[PDB]
Amino acid sequence: KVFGRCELAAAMKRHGLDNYRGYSLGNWVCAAKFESNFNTQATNRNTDGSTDYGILQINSRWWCNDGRTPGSRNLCNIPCSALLSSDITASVNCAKKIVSDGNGMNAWVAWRNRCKGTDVQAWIRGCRL
């Protein structure tokens, strides 16, 4: 599924991601924009053989099981495929765990480099919320 910008804002809010760990909704929408372009089926292979999955490009090294990332963990207790679903519940639930892990949204490289400190409210501007 390819989400529209306000459509994803609304889905994220329904699943309680707005202001989760103090991160406003625009930060989550921005991160999803530059991680996946709002496509739930986005995947990206890393040089280390791990893979990033879904709207927020969650990595198999630590958070999900894909069977092909030696030495890896599955801290969200889900198959990585679940992160590619049209319904974002598994990705939101896993994102809450990630963002609680200590470095906040800096775990998302694309957030740090393209969203952090920018006018992230722009991503929810005009949205009926």
Site residues, Au ion (CB under 5 A): 24, 26, 50-51, 60, 65-69, 72, 74, 79, 104, 121
- C-beta closer to Au ion: residue 40 or 69: 69
Partners of 39 in beta bridges: 2
- Residue 3: CB minimum distance to Au ion, A: 17
- C-beta closer to Au ion: residue 50 or 91: 50
- C-beta closer to Au ion: residue 26 or 54: 26
| Rounded Cα–Cα distance for residues 75 and 96 (Å) | 12
Residue nearest to Au ion according to CB distances in the complex:
26
**Residues identified as active-site:** 35, 52
Q: Structure tokens of 29?
A: 């929408």
Residue 101 known to bind ligand: yes
Buried b (16+ CB within 10 A) or exposed e, 54-82: bbbbbbbbbbbbbeebeebeeebebebeb
Q: What is the DSSP letter of 121?
A: G
Annotated binding site for substrate: 101
